[PDB]
């Protein structure tokens, strides 16, 4: 039924501008308000504004009245909100919303600095009985990666431990636990995939 | 601007208990038209929010009846009864009443198991890192309760602070656990000038830590 589709993220130098879309679907476009909203951390939410679609006026919060310009567009039922003057405090997710559903949100970073890909190393024990394995990924920029572990067979023995900053740039780790019946009689992979620079690494850990 | 304060921050509860979620506002949330604009909002780890409970008490389509809304003025309530295991999340209380739209800080909801202790394993740097004149040493502790962790580093015998860095995982959906990872980024140099790397695990499941090392000779 109805369903918000977001832009994908972005990568935004400080005091550029971006714009960033919300095509809807399933539904009258005219009908509903779409309200736009910042996430910080994945915890704290802020509510920016919506925008009378028919009639194109805009409620505005406050705090964000300079930052944020909503419009729409009638005819491809789509949402716009462009964020100037950009600083690293608009680094968030912004979620655009209907009363009834919301998008999958966007991803902005702002940074100057550039798509960095990550380096990947192998974490295998070293020189009972179940074995954890695991792959680093270290150095990259900016979020996110995924580490797959055996084309997603291995699913639920497996820790994804959220990025933290080093020297600028990120750093995760992944670790999976098998039996030790398991490796290295059959084989273990990570696979890093890292959209933002359009890479993917695949690591076979040896014993 | 209306002010919305969720109590508690985390609410720790057993699966089939009834957990109680609080939302007070600075002013009344009772608008002008006789109507109070009052939502409740579920967020998953990893997903979007989604809609609870609006006008107060009516609950969305889809959304099960021991989820219940109640409330008036400047008080409010979410009530769960009982927790199910996919209700792990954090829970926003949101008033549409006044401009701006404000939403509470949100009140992660937390499932209760028995203490377990964490799984330690050491990774000594692979050899292929150490091309780039660095080393890291990763240590993993996972499946262990509750949060409350510690992690500390010793060379040769000695404890190490500079160049750790630590993440925590949010709590497993399946077991209830909480996982940590914890790196000590050397110089090549510096590692190849020491011997035993140690990891040190402090848990309440003992007063004693788990320790777990390596001689980079071995």
């Known amino acids: 039924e109805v369903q918000l589709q977001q832009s994908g993220p972005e990568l935004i130098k400080p005091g550029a501008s971006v714009k960033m879309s919300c095509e809807a679907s399933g539904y009258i476009f005219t009908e509903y308000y779409i309200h736009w909203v910042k996430q910080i951390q994945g915890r704290s939410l802020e509510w920016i504004g919506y925008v009378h679609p028919k009639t194109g006026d805009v409620i505005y919060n406050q705090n964000f009245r300079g930052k944020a310009t909503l419009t729409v567009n009638r005819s491809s039922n789509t949402a716009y909100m462009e964020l100037h003057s950009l600083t690293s405090e608009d680094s968030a997710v912004y979620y655009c919303?209907?009363?009834?559903?919301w998008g999958q949100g966007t991803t902005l970073t702002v940074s100057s600095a550039k798509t960095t890909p990550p380096s990947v190393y192998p974490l295998a024990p070293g020189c009972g009985s179940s074995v954890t394995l695991g792959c680093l990924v270290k150095g990259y920029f900016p979020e996110s990666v995924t580490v797959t572990w055996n084309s997603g067979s291995l699913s639920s023995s497996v820790h994804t431990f959220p990025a933290l900053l080093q020297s600028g740039l990120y750093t995760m780790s992944s670790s999976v636990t098998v039996p030790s019946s398991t490796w290295p009689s059959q084989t273990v992979t990570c696979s890093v995939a890292h959209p933002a620079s359009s890479t993917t690494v695949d690591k076979k850990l040896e014993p | 601007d209306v002010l919305l304060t969720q109590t508690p921050l985390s609410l720790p509860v057993n699966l089939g208990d009834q957990a109680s979620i609080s939302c007070r506002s600075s002013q009344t949330i009772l608008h002008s038209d006789g109507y109070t604009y009052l939502e409740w909002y579920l967020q998953r780890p990893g997903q979007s929010p989604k809609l609870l409970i609006y006008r107060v008490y009516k609950r969305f389509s889809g959304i099960p009846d021991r989820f219940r809304g109640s409330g008036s003025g400047m008080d409010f309530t979410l009530t769960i009864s009982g927790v199910e295991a996919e209700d792990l999340g954090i829970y926003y209380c949101f008033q549409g009443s006044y401009v701006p739209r404000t939403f509470g800080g949100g009140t992660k909801l937390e499932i209760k198991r028995a203490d377990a202790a964490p799984t330690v394993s050491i990774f000594p740097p692979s050899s292929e890192q150490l091309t780039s004149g660095g080393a890291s040493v990763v240590c993993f502790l996972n499946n262990f309760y509750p949060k409350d962790i510690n992690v500390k580093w010793k060379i040769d015998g000695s404890e190490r602070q500079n160049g750790v860095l630590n993440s925590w995982t949010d709590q497993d959906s399946k077991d209830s656990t909480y996982s940590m990872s914890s790196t000590l980024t050397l110089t090549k140099d510096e590692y190849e000038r020491h011997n035993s790397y140690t990891c040190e695990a402090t848990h309440k499941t003992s007063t004693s830590p788990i320790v777990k090392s390596f001689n980079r000779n071995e």
């Open positions: 919303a209907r009363w009834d559903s």
